[PDB]
Amino acid sequence: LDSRLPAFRNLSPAARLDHIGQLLGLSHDDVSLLANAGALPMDIANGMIENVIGTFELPYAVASNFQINGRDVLVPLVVEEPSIVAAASYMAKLARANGGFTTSSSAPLMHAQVQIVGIQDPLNARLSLLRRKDEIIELANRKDQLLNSLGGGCRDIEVHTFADTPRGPMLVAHLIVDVRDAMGANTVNTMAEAVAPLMEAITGGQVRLRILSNLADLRLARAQVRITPQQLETAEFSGEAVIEGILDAYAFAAVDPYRAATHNKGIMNGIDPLIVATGNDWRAVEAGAHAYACRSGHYGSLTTWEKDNNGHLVGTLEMPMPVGLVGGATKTHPLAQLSLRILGVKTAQALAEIAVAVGLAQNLGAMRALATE
Amino acid sequence: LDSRLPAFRNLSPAARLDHIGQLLGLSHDDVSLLANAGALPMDIANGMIENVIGTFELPYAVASNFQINGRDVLVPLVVEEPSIVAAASYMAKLARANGGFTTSSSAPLMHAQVQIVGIQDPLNARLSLLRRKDEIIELANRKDQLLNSLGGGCRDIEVHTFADTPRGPMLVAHLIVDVRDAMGANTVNTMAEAVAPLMEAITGGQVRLRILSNLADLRLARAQVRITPQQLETAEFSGEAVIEGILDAYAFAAVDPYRAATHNKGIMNGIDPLIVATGNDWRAVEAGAHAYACRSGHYGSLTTWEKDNNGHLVGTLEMPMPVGLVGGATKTHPLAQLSLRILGVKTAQALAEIAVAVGLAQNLGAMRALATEGIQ
Ligand SMILES: CC(C)(COP(=O)(O)OP(=O)(O)OC[C@H]1O[C@@H](n2cnc3c(N)ncnc32)[C@H](O)[C@@H]1OP(=O)(O)O)[C@@H](O)C(=O)NCCC(=O)NCCSC(=S)C[C@@](C)(O)CC(=O)O
Secondary structure, three states: OOOOOOOHHHOOHHHHHHHHHHHHOOOHHHHHHHHOOOOOOHHHHHHHOOOEEEEEEEEEEEEOOOEEOOEEOOEEEEOOOOOHHHHHHHHHHHHHOOOOEEEEEOOOEEEEEEEEEOOOOHHHHHHHHHHOHHHHHHHHHHOOHHHHHOOOEEEEEEEEEEOOOOOOOEEEEEEEEEOOOEOOHHHHHHHHHHHHHHHHHHHOOEEEEEEEOOOOOOOEEEEEEEEOHHHHOOOOOOHHHHHHHHHHHHHHHHHOHHHHHHHHHHHHHHHHHHHHHOOOOHHHHHHHHHHHHOOOOOOOOOEEEEEOOOOOEEEEEEEEOOOOOEOOOOOOOHHHHHHHHHHOOOOHHHHHHHHHHHHHHHHHHHHHHHHHO | OOOOOOOHHHOOHHHHHHHHHHHHOOOHHHHHOOOOOOOOOHHHHHHHOOOEEEEEEEEEEEEOOOEEOOEEOOEEEEOOOOOHHHHHHHHHHHHHOOOOEEEEEOOOEEEEEEEEEOOOOHHHHHHHHHHOHHHHHHHHOOOOHHHHHOOOEEEEEEEEEEOOOOOOOEEEEEEEEEOOOOOOHHHHHHHHHHHHHHHHHHHOOEEEEEEEOOOOOOOEEEEEEEEOHHHHOOOOOOHHHHHHHHHHHHHHHHHOHHHHHHHHHHHHHHHHHHHHHOOOOHHHHHHHHHHHHOOOOOOOOOEEEEEOOOOOEEEEEEEEOOOOOOOHHHHHOHHHHHHHHHHOOOOHHHHHHHHHHHHHHHHHHHHHHHHHOOOO
16 A cells, blocks of 8 residues: 555545545445445434434545555544644655654553442452452453453453542452453453452452443553654754754643643544544543543653654654454444554554554644744 | 423434424424435535545434523534433433532633743743733734624733743743633634734743643533432432442542543543534543643542532532634534534533533433442
8 A cells, every 4th residue: 555645635525535445445335435425324323322313424534644664554534623634644744754653552451440348458358359369360251251262351450449538448459451452341341340249259348330441551552753854944944943842842741731731632633533433432542641641640741752863853652542443333333344444454452553653643743833833 | 492302212313303393493404404414515524624535424412301500401412332312311300300400601711822932031031021911912902803892802911930841941921812602722823923922022032832722721611410319219229328329439530540530531421422513622622621630630530529418419510611603613514503503502601511511410320320230
């Protein structure tokens, strides 16, 4: 694949769609899903959520120029706001000159919380759980034999205590679960429910909440980009001066939450539309993102911007990125499936890596514009 | 208006649309926007964002039972995830028995930031700006005649310093701008750019960033709800015990960020789908919400839950809520306009007040389910 899409910006929607179909070797019938309204039929929509009266469209777009670990990728995006897609495509074009985006990710590990109340010895009860951790892990894994055969499963447990709250002592167990190609919510919740009776027997306490955490800080995806000063030169400003301006803008985000909120919103402009296009839960991605940004005790920037030993601008994005290829609405929505086909992703972590590349690109675009006006 | 919508959950989509069309007196043309797929014309879609190749549908639903300061309201929602609309609807049903949701909001005030670097005396420059604030405020208000004539504009300035960063001393001025019925980005960005030269002249620094803040903590919207124990009784648990379980779930969120993230995500399950239904920017609402949740230096719960002196469960939500009745897709998408019609909102702050009511109801529904689920 060549993702450069020359003159895409100026083609009609129909022409653009035909080119995409040609590049990818889409069938006529796949192209029909975008060439005509109504790919989400009403019997599917009506079964997805409650009280349905119709469907609501947003535009479906494709960003150009992306390249991830040396492979060109086409990126579908669904959103209402202008300039997002153009900026992403432009920053991807710049990145390609220097190797594109380089990405990595952790295993798809999600937390399942099990909250325990009713005991006067939470700190002791924590150790009772840990002593019996293999038993707990085995009980969790008995509940999803398929996931274990797919290469996932409950890997570990961690236990945290809150001995002094206004509502009395609490203990919180986390199952740590590899959820393979799912976002993970229903997969881990089921394990949390399975182990609850055993945790009650061990601790002597009462289990209350059994629920994933959206702070998915064991499910991290990472992206890098590099930009040279020559690329950032304008009529008004040297590239070197733009790079210094971007570093100043970054330091401003790092110290001031009023700026960090906006800086990180720019990142989510790039990410959330890919999450929507793939039928994934964008509230989950947002909650993970912004809670992670404040993990230090200060709400700061998700990205970093620095100058390397050659004077080049180097950016990173590392963040939680819980997404699926299966589960929820990813399989339900025919255009979610088409998006995954467009992307060519074969694992959920591959999708997560593309997401962070797009977020990094969108922040780059915002940094560049704001440093050059 | 009566928003109870009896039997709604079991009616066909077409019958549901008929029933709300009767209640509202929707025109033929309004109803027909949902007779067939494709209500967003491709020429409008193509003008909205770049590189458009088609459209992407999500389900469009209406939550029932909502009442805001005594008035029934119907709430359109666009989202992919189950249980949200039902939970919001059921908690709204319970709320009605005790007066519905009570709401308030601040004026639609947004921050514009102007970042100034390279000043050798930033703390002194800040006073030079504050002395000249009327001048700055008048410059800000020079160009947007329409906003001024509608009762908005720049109201004030504040100035903050960060004298020691790794990139040297920074001054940051904020324009405080009433943006009336807009979210406000273009309004405040434009003002930030306009005032920049003058600030530079006063301070002697280089202006760098000129840009809104999404941490819209002067644009707050507030909701309250009340639920009695009799309303919460289940087969297994008294309503009193359910209240205690909900308070336990709240305290857990207040102390543990791993729970708070999830808890707040449930609020946003309620809010974001209304933002989407009205053509508004949900990334801006998300950023304001979650940044606000950590203003203290601890990432906590946006909602509060207590028991009052009568033993009733009382909940609050106060948060930033920047939304528009105008701008972008809110104007150009025919269903964003239909949603506004369904809602009956006449100002952006009224839309914000409904948003927080729905977020509050969603969080209550989520907690209630988790607090009452038996052990397996
Ligand atoms: C890219 C923009 C929108 C237009 O740039 P321009 O200099 O006109 O680009 P140019 O015309 O040179 O085209 C260069 C490349 O840019 C792409 N491109 C430009 N315009 C379009 C378009 N209309 N459609 C598609 N592609 C476009 C395209 O890839 C093209 O390559 P090609 O010539 O090979 O096709 C430029 O205004 C810009 O970079 N904006 C970045 C900031 C921006 O508004 N971002 C949008 C979201 S807003 C955001 S993230 C919120 C913030 C800013 O508050 C976040 C924060 O505060 O941090």
